[PDB]
């Protein structure tokens, strides 16, 4: 019973699936739109593209910093169910080894290297 049980439950309650979207993939830079908004309920299907970085897993989870070269390096981290989300579509490839936090990217990247993977 206990924890596992009851809790599993309440969450199931609220989050339900984070909106069946189960497209994780390690690599894949990809793109989405979160409601993220302010100013006159300007909740905007805002879409950021980002090279897939990491994640938290259980009730509460999060599609991690996918780093995005904006013109400086900006990495974007976002909670998974987090009703906050609407569109979440992949573009990139779910490839590469050593598993996540492979910031190798954000760090010494270098477009070339980037592609080097």
């Amino acid at each position: 019973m206990n924890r596992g049980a009851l809790i599993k439950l309440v969450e199931s309650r609220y989050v339900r699936t984070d909106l069946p979207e189960f497209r994780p993939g390690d690599t894949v830079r990809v793109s989405y739109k979160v409601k993220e908004g302010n100013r006159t309920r300007i909740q905007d299907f805002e879409g950021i593209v980002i090279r897939i970085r990491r994640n938290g897993f259980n009730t509460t989870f999060t599609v991690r910093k996918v780093s995005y070269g904006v013109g400086v390096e900006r990495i974007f981290p976002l909670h998974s169910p987090l009703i906050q989300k609407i569109d979440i579509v992949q573009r990139g490839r779910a490839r590469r080894a050593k598993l996540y936090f492979i910031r190798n990217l954000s760090d010494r990247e270098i477009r070339r290297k980037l592609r080097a993977d």
């Binding site: 409601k35 302010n38 904006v70 400086v72 900006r74 990495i75 974007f76 981290p77």
Partner: protein, 122 residues
């Protein structure tokens, strides 16, 4: 994420996108040039011409790297540390500047100009 003494980045009418702040402009007990805050500093880095100089202003907090945790559980981090220089009132320094969007900023609000100003990729 924060700092007192600091080698920070900017990109306004900068002498150089870099100045060292003393501390936080908030509630007398600084300890955090924190995201979206306002604080104190002088230049560290050079400045071709430019009316900027090797002085000291105060201004407002951009980027950080160690958790931009927002109200909506919006989350982010840029491998960059920088804010925009202020002229008194706050009224920003330069005509433009190299950087972009995201809540925290506008949210602090007082600086809409910065707001519309740094938009696109970079």
């Amino acid at each position: 994420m924060i700092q007192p003494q600091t080698y920070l980045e900017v990109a306004d009418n900068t002498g150089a996108r870099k100045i060292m702040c003393i501390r936080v402009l908030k509630g007398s007990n600084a300890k955090y040039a924190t995201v979206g805050d306002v604080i104190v500093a002088s230049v560290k880095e050079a400045i071709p011409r430019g009316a900027v100089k090797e002085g000291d202003v105060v201004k407002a907090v951009v980027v950080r790297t160690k958790k931009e945790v927002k109200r909506p559980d919006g989350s982010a981090i840029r491998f960059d540390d920088n804010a925009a220089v202020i002229i008194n009132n706050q009224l920003e320094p330069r005509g433009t500047r190299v950087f972009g969007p995201v809540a925290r900023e506008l949210r602090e609000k007082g600086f809409m100009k910065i707001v519309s100003l740094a938009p696109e990729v970079l």
